Design an enzyme around this catalytic site. Sequence first.
Site, short mmCIF file in Angstrom:
data_model
loop_
_atom_site.label_atom_id
_atom_site.label_comp_id
_atom_site.label_asym_id
_atom_site.label_seq_id
_atom_site.Cartn_x
_atom_site.Cartn_y
_atom_site.Cartn_z
N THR A 158 0.86 -1.22 0.00
CA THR A 158 0.00 0.00 0.00
C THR A 158 0.89 1.25 0.00
O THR A 158 1.75 1.36 0.89
CB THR A 158 -0.96 0.01 1.20
OG1 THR A 158 -1.70 -1.21 1.19
CG2 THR A 158 -1.91 1.19 1.18
N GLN A 159 0.66 2.15 -0.96
CA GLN A 159 1.40 3.43 -1.12
C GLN A 159 0.41 4.59 -1.15
O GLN A 159 -0.81 4.34 -1.25
CB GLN A 159 2.21 3.43 -2.42
CG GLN A 159 3.47 2.59 -2.37
CD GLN A 159 4.41 2.90 -3.51
OE1 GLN A 159 4.46 4.03 -4.01
NE2 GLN A 159 5.18 1.91 -3.93
#
Lengths: 231, 204, 233, 240, 211, 244, 5, 5, 195, 235, 222
Positions: free
Chosen positions: C1-2
């Site tokens: 997750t970014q």
Amino acid sequence: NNYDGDTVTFSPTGRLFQVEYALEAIKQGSVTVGLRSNTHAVLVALKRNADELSSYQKKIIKCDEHMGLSLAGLAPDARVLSNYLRQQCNYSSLVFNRKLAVERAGHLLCDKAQKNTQSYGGRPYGVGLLIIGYDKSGAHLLEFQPSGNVTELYGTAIGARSQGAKTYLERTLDTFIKIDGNPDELIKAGVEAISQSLRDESLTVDNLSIAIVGKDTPFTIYDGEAVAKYI
Amino acid sequence: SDPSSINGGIVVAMTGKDCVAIACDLRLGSQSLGVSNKFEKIFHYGHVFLGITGLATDVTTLNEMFRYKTNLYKLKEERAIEPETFTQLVSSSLYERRFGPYFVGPVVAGINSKSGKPFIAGFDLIGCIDEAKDFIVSGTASDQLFGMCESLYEPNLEPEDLFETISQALLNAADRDALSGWGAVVYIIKKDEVVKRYLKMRQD
Amino acid sequence: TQQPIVTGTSVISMKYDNGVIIAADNLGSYGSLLRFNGVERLIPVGDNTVVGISGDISDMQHIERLLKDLVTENAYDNPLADAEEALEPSYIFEYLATVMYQRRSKMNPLWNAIIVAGVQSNGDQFLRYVNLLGVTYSSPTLATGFGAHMANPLLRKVVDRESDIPKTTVQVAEEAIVNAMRVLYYRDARSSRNFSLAIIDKNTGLTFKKNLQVENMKWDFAKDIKGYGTQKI
Amino acid sequence: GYDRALSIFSPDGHIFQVEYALEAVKRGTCAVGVKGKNCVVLGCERRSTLKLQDTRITPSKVSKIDSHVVLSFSGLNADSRILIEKARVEAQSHRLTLEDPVTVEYLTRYVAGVQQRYTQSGGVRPFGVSTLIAGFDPRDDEPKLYQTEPSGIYSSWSAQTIGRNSKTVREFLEKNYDRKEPPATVEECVKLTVRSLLEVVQTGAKNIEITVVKPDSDIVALSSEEINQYVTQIEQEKQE
Amino acid sequence: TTLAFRFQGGIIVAVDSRATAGNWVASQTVKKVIEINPFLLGTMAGGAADCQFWETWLGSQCRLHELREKERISVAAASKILSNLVYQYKGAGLSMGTMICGYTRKEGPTIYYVDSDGTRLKGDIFCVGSGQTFAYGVLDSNYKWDLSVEDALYLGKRSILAAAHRDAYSGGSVNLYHVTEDGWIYHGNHDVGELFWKVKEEEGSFNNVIG
Amino acid sequence: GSRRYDSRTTIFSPEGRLYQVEYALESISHAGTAIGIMASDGIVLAAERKVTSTLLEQDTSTEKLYKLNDKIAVAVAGLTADAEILINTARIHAQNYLKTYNEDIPVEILVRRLSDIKQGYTQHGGLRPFGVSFIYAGYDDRYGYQLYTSNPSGNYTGWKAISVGANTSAAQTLLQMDYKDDMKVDDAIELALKTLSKTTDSSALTYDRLEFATIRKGANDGEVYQKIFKPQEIKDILVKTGIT
Amino acid sequence: XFLXX
Amino acid sequence: XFLXX
Amino acid sequence: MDIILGIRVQDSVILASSKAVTRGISVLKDSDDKTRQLSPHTLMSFAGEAGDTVQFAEYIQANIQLYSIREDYELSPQAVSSFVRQELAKSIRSRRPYQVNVLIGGYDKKKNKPELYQIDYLGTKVELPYGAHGYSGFYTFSLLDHHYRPDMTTEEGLDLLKLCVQELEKRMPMDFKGVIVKIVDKDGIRQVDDF
Amino acid sequence: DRGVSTFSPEGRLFQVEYSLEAIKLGSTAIGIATKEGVVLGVEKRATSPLLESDSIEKIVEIDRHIGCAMSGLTADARSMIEHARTAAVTHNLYYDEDINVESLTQSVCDLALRFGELMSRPFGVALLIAGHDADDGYQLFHAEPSGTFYRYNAKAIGSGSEGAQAELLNEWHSSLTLKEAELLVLKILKQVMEEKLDENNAQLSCITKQDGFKIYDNEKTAELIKELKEKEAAE
Amino acid sequence: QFNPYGDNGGTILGIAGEDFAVLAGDTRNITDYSINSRYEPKVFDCGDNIVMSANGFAADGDALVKRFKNSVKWYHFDHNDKKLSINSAARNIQHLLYGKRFFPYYVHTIIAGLDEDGKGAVYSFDPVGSYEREQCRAGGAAASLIMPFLDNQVNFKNQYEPGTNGKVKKPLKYLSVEEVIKLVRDSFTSATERHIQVGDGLEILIVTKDGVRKEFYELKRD
Ligand SMILES: [Mg+2]
Ligand SMILES: [Mg+2]
Ligand SMILES: [Mg+2]
């Protein structure tokens, strides 16, 4: 003598005896011939049987639509190395949408065979391979030895009495190299080449094994009544 | 769903003149439902006494664990563990489970066999040592016990007088807590004799 | 997750008769802050491919390093590295497309939209899109971000289908790209006036143009606009 | 981990470690299995060089794998415990998944499989143990007697012996045991088993152990006096 | 909607043929009975993929048993392989409600209910699915042990039809099976399109519907 | 590679013997004799210390007799270092059982597990076996008083009276001669000392060269007491039996 | 989505 | 709980 | 799973366990035996999460049966209860704990005394004269507090148990389809067929 | 000592060559392939008369369309059969079809050379793998511990192999019936077997497209033995 | 939070004849309210006379087709160039899909070809590998529009013989390749009119014993 117990040991003259003993297994193997023009590359393999009741040991393996080899020596070792080539050819296609170069195919086999000659516990591969293929730089023929040494050639032969066929191709070099856009004539030259390695036995319908790859020809193997044309 | 206040229960420890007292209630419940009126929370390993409040499964587990460790200690050391040493062992063992702790409020009590000094100590669930001259309290009625002990307690009480003080501290504290009570037990510990008394208290 | 921090906006491109054109502005936005103004978002691979990248710049710089390393790795034990066995646009794209999907599949994506524009060895035009989801598609015109909404409509008026490609010259094609970059400067709040443009022709090869500016802008009519409805001054 | 290939082929095509494991069995105390018409009897020799023994607590030669199957052995005593433990665990594991106790053939096949695994696994030597596995399949009244050996081969026997002087007692059983008519009763089956051990043992005092297994988990071990009565009866009939 | 009940003449197994994705009728031609072997039947209710995959997998495990043990697997052993499998995946989100119905010599006719939360129950009657209650209503009120093979087959068929009617997520067609000491016998595919009206006319039931 | 230097500790001889186990027993046969005698009302453990020096601290010393728990003790014969590894394992195994079942471990279960560890070192791992033979003296509420012995092979057997270490052949003959089943602890104490006194390689048997322990029900009412004898207590018991 | 009688 | 100047 | 009761009397332990297995708005079965025999003189009743209950019960059963074969000896009810508690005490801090509450009714042959142990899914063990799991306790405990005597016979125990089932059938919301009763004494485990 | 995966100066693996010597000590197994089916027969060779011969399992089912006979250290074959059965069932699960007899043999022969310093030594057992598939019809394979497999019209393995193979060379033709093949296995087994051939010390089996793989009863084989003796005396 | 899935729209349609089978699919690729490509093929010849389409999330669709194509290649290598039957392919694809049961391929898969009797075969899969052979299947965005039309026109559902008092059903019969392509073209023009994600182009792949033929038709581009 005292330096042939495993592959990790050098002899006093700087020889690897286990690698040389693996090389010996190829010489006992049935003869197979490789030769190419500019358009096509041909494998011819004399298959061997246990007796008259047995089948003839299949010598040629397909790796991709554009690449495959013939074997001489331990068949199970050829299966391992051919399976590795299939995966490397396949990796090149899926990841890079790119047909694996026949030269890289050689480099990958060389590096795989080498690791088995420098580590304790393992053993060298006991088979020699003739890899043919047609890539972006035309037709190719490679000779793989389980020492790790891979060599690109116009023509060659490995197995028992391979010196007879290898001498013929060395004489015929100038002729067969220019057999361009003629599959049947390049095979004929290959069948006449392997014939120089025969003793007492002759090429029969279930004995001879031919494979071809070229410009507008996928790697295909001919066995049984399909090779009756070339006897 | 608060592990420390599912089963309920209390432990209190006091010091006197050449003696220590440790006491506990007998209630084990499942929130509102009272289940057992025989669940003792005070154990002993040689002359060292350990009272454990909180989640009952962990009370039982830690008793079995400290019996295990004190038995191996005695075999290798060729002597009974002392209260000061045992206190360090409890602290070590609880902090070993820092990020998955036993939901307990343990209380060490005993007399050092060499020096003859009365000793009591308390811990949080992650093994922080709380040493005290006067008294240690633990359980669901800790607030009540703190209030009782702080007012009733005086230093250098005789074993017979100390018994009355610790008993009245537990009983009146337990009667103001819903999850504590259902009978109580008091240990009076002298240098080389230990008296165990069951108290009569209201059974609600 | 970014979450993307420093970001690049629209990359626009189209095919013409002999090759492909690709363009992207030189801005590295930090949210609403127009932080960095010297950012090159077109990265040439050999003399026959240009990779235009939008989205997170840290991940763009990672992809730069991968492409740089790919050229090095291809050259190893390859006598024909500058001839028959040179890197094709199709090889470079498929590699990126593999990485982009592998990363999305590990729930740790390269937060980018990528257009690989180039010319194959047989002279065929190559133009294909890939993004953080590993979604791939090809079209006579491709654009990312706001480009997809505003540029594509304008570029499709020139090359609406396959049959329009031979009829489109490099002069007409470049004019449409430069026009699209002006429209994006008018209407995209995270765009800059300065941009780069690259032409990969099968005859003239790779032409990389830097420090281009949006010009011939219409602002004069603004003086006549007074108030938000009823105001006469 | 220790990887060495200890069990390997020799030029003549023998695995010496497996064959030396059989020599360990040949050293072990004699064990005999005789199956009658409605029962199996496991006879076991106990060497009499050990006096001042405590027979209450000393590990018994015959081991219960489940309530319906038993395992006797010849060879290394320490090795036998590992096979018995594994067999007992597999017995409970079978009941848990199949909801039915093991067949004598299945339990044998498992134990034999374990013995085989140790003959081509790196870092381990073969079990210096041969086993006689006897019992009755669930809801079945047909007697079962199986033999295993270090190599991992197993087979069913009408009657069989293993251990020291086993070739002598096998010679006895081969002429005394009739296939057409096995021991009809428990007494007949026990007597033939005791007789066969009396060819080898020495004295019929605290040297012979007898265990009788009957259908539906009915296993009992005979006491000294009970066995001594068979010894006394056989010797009186012999003097003729 | 799937059901299987034990009676004098063996086991009856009846299932509907409808598969739904939300309120969308995806298919009306689905096999919800898997033929593990000539003496074993498996019913399917829940996630199509979960049931289909794991019950064909069960068939492979039952084949490996009779190869290794030279004997057909017990209904108990077969059901427990599946129940022990789904229990390993408990909490993962597997959605299966199945019934393992078969005959063996040692057991006789046997039915085992096996669901995805690890429940395994031996029983004479079970109804599993979204319309299990509708099937129960008709089956229970008409069930006797002394039913004939002809009457038992019909009751099983009629019980699916009842559910196929009322339950929105059940319908398509009825697949009948009869399990005896000799193995399972297929008793045809019955489309509800024709069966409903045929039953309504002949039986005089379904008076709620406009004739 | 390393194959060249491997002794192969876990293999069979042509005769079907375990080389290392046989050589470990040959090692143990040179260790100081240890005797266990089981009476009807208790057990005696007697052990001869290996050629003592006059400047050895005798009172604060432990070589032969070790305590596993309150109910079980062991007499050692062989490498002491090897024994202490196995003793600490046995002590932990006993506590694991108590923690699990809230009951003191039955003697045989402890003996079997310790014997199963020794067996492991003879079959796999390629390590040398433990050069140790134990005499287990213990009590439980199932079988009462029990004597066992384990050896490097991992094979264990139960006994009424047994010797391990040096001169076991001579020692076992003397025990077999004078032992009877209705024997008391006080009689077993005398037999243990008299046997060591005759089988000893020393000139005369003295208090300083002995370790002694009893496991009686001599405590107050239906409970077992372990007595590891002090130097002065051995000196007194040696005079009381008329050896010195 | 995935189909679910 | 937990004790915490 | 819902109702499991236990009453220890003079010479026996009596376990009563509901027969209903409910899933959603359907009673799937009305003849379910919520108990496993761990050994000839030890019985364990269980209630809790579907699947976990039987899986846990059979796992314990297999372990106790393995011990019985290995030692040729029956573990005391106290020893079995301690083993079970430790398994649940391990379980509660696992990735997915066993959500199972058990009663262990056993007859100690060495002491010649009946013993009833109540263990919840947390691994909370107590020895009781009478025990219950779930909502059952909220009725039965106060009832037994009144009517229970320690010197009662097995027959008096069954009448005391009937009084509990009647109260539950009257005031419990759910239909639990009666109970299977089993008695543990010196002669082992037997089932009361008519209750 | 020396390594396990070591080559001899002649270019052969010592351990593979030594494992072949172990197979020569093994009991005889014969296979004959016809257009009507494939026949598999084995010598049981009971070490003692007390040993119940019916428990000697040297012919084995892999799937309904593939059988298997063994010779040598027969204990080693168990894990090879287990793999073959799993391979056969697994392929059926993945592809909803029967697996090719050649593909099955290749899967078994892959285990062969997975030894060294994987298992500690090669297999001390040779397998005759007989089966039928739609593509190549009735097939007989000889799977060695070398990792090599040959297809055979007829093949003998074990102690009497070279003597039996020479006999099969003369007797075999392409138009053999199943009944002719059955008798021919019994005939050649009786010639090479030490003890006199009967239904108890010898076992027959066959694989046909219709009925699949079947091990014959001692009653059925006994009649074929009696039919064989009568036909030899008839000329 | 990063969402690993997306909707690339489009719709696919598989019909089986007596000696042939068609697999049709629109060439439009979309995300939200934007057109990505007007010609992006998602119906593929996978060899051995098997045509395949994995409609939905294009990234997962491409990945699956790629893996199956590779599965066909290795089937030849491992089983002596044996032809992968449509039924064998179907089971193989179930294991590919269910392999990612807990991170599913967000696609509706349809394969078409000939069974081993030479008769037309269509198999349809859900995202997690549940499959079923049918005469008829529509998949994707406009499946709900096309499928009930196919039930009526291919399988003759709700159609009775005129004058038979709704007692005799219209008899089932195989459709000609001409009649099938008419239904496919009318299905996609209807779907294009009423679904925004369907249009641009229609690509049909027809499978006979002779091989795999292609046909392309324009659709409305609004
Ligand atoms: Mg209170
Ligand atoms: Mg109250
Ligand atoms: Mg539009």
